[PDB]
Structures are given as structure tokens and as C-alpha cells.
Symmetry: none
Subunit: 76 residues, 6 copies
């Protein structure tokens, strides 16, 4: 007869990846030799950030989000 | 006879990748020899950032987002 | 007879990649020999950034986003 | 008839006198040594020697090689 | 008839006298040594030697090689 | 008839006298030495020697090579 065959076999092996921030870095022996601050007064007021001989690693990642939308429709 | 065959087999092996920020770097023995600040007064007021001999690694990643949209439609 | 065969087999092996910021760098022994600041007063007011012998690595990545849109449509 | 007499004679000397031999050091005096150090930074390997009076002898050499070969062949 | 008398004689000397041999040092005096160092930075290898009086002898050489071949062939 | 006498004689000397041999150093005096250093930066290898009085002897040479060959061929 006038038969109909539909085979709907879509295949997804895809990857969505975010690598965001500080990844796979090497920090080998970081630091200064000598740091000296000599004063009679240190007077810090009203939103002061002071760093003296410090080591800081700071990572902020507001991003790196993944959105995947997939839709399938078969209508006979 | 007057038959119909439809074979809907799309294949996706694709990659969507973000690599954002500080990735795979080498920092080998960073830092100054000597840092010296001599004063009688240090007077810091009202939104001061002071760095004396510090090492900072700062990474901000608001970006690096991935969006994937895929749509499939078969109408007979 | 007057049969119809449709084979719909598109294949996607594509890569979409962003590499944004500080990637794969080598920083080997960075830093000054001697840094000296000599005063009677340091007087810092109202939105001051002061760096004395510091090393800073700063990476901002608002970008590096990926958008992939794919649509498939078969109508008989 | 054939007669072969093979009588080579070796009384030879091979000698090395290498380094510091037969010296006289009568009352050697090293002075006062002062090494004052502050606020130094070293990022790589340091080798340091400090002292008043050194006698140093180093001998990688002074080796002897003697090769001797005797071949007597008849017919 | 044939007669062969192979009788070479070796009384030879091969000698190396290398370095500091037979010296006289009578009351050698190293002076006062001062090394004052401050606020120094070194990014790579440092080799340092400090001192008043040094005797240094280094001998990579003074090696002897002797080679001696004897061949007698009859027929 | 044939007679061969092979009687070479070697009384030779090969000698090397290399470096500092047979010297007299009567009351040598190194002066006072001062090395004042501040605020220095070195990006690469440093070799430093500081001192009042040095005797340095270095001998890479003074090696001896003796090669001797004796061949007697009959027929």
C-alpha cells in the first residue's frame, strides 16, 4: 500500500564548557626579598586599603554560566 | 507502491568552549629585591589604595558565558 | 512506483572557542632591584592609588562569551 | 736452522708530580676578615667561601697511561 | 742458517712536575679584609670567595701517555 | 748465513716543569682591602673574589706524550 515510514533519530554528542577564572597557573616561589616601612605615625582613615609585603590571589567569576536549549518536534 | 520514507538523522559532535581569565600562566620567582619607605608620617584618608612591595594576582571574569540553542522540526 | 525517499543527515563537528585574558604567559624572575621612597610626610587624600615596588597581574574579561544558534527544518 | 732471541728490556719510568709538593710555608698569617651583610636578596644558587687563610690544592690531572705491545710471529 | 737477536733497551724517563713545587713562602701576610654589603639583589647564580691570604693550586694537566709497540715477523 | 742484531738503546728524558717551581716569597704583604657596596642589582651570574694576598697557580698543560714503535721484518 501507500505506506509511510518516519525514522527520527537525531544524535547529540556535543560539549558546552566554560573555564572561567584562574585555572592551571603555576606560581613558583613568589615574594620580594625585604620590605620595610619606617615612620613615627601611620594614620589611616575612611576607606584605606594598605598592602605591605603581602601576596594576594583574588579571583571573582560572576560569569562563566552555560545555557543550552534544545527542542524537538515531529508532527504527522 | 507510492510509499514515503523519511530518515531524520542529523548528528552534532560540536564543541562550544570559553577559556576566560588567567589560564596556564607560569610566574617563576616574582618579587623585588628591596622596597623601603621612610617617613615621619604616613597620612592616608578617603579612598586610598597603597601597595608597598606587595604581589597581587587579580582575575575578574563577568564574561565567558556560553549560549547554545538548537531546534529540530519535522512536519509530514 | 512513484515512492519518495528523504535522507536528512547533516553532520556538525565544528568548534567554537574563546581564549580571552592572560593565557599561557611566562613571567620569569620579574621585580626591581631596589625601590626607596624617602620623605618627612606622605599625605594621600581623596581617590589615590599608590604603588611602591609592587607587582600586579590584573585580568578583566567582560567578553569572551559564545553564542551558537542552530535550526533544522524538514517539511514534506 | 733458525734462532730467534726476543729479549727487549724496559727500565723506564713514567711519573706525575701534580699539585703542591715540597713547599715550605713559614709562619703564614691571614688577616682579620669581616663580612657584614644586611638586606640582600638572592633568587638563584649561592656558593660562598669566607676565611682568613686558605691552602687549596685540586688535581683532576696527573694521570698516567702506559700501553705496551709485543708481537713475535713465525711463518 | 739465520740468527735474530731482538734486544732493544729502554731506560727512558717521562715526567710531569705540574703546579706549585719546591716554593718557599716566608712570613706571607694577608691584610685586613672588610666586605660591607647592603641593599643588594641577585637574580642569578652567585659564586663568592672572601679572605685575606690564599694559596690555590689547580692541575687539570700534567698527565703522561706512553705507547710502545714491538713487532718481530719472520717469514 | 744471516745474522741480525737489533739493539737500539733509549736513555731519553721527556720532562715538563709547569706552574710555580722553586720560587722564594720573602715577607710578601697584602694591603688592607675594603669593599663597600650598596644599592646594587645583578640580573645574571656573578663570580666574585675578594682578598688581600693571592698565590694562584693553574696548569691545564704540561702533559707528555711519548710514542715508540719497533718493527723488524725478515722475509
Amino acid at each position: 500500500g501507500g505506506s509511510v515510514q518516519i525514522v527520527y533519530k537525531p544524535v547529540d554528542l556535543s560539549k558546552v564548557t566554560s573555564k572561567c577564572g584562574s585555572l592551571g597557573n603555576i606560581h613558583h616561589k613568589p615574594g620580594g626579598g625585604q620590605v620595610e616601612v619606617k615612620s613615627e605615625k601611620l594614620d589611616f582613615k575612611d576607606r584605606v586599603q594598605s598592602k605591605i609585603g603581602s601576596l594576594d590571589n583574588i579571583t571573582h567569576v560572576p560569569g562563566g554560566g552555560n545555557k543550552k536549549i534544545e527542542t524537538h518536534k515531529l508532527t504527522f
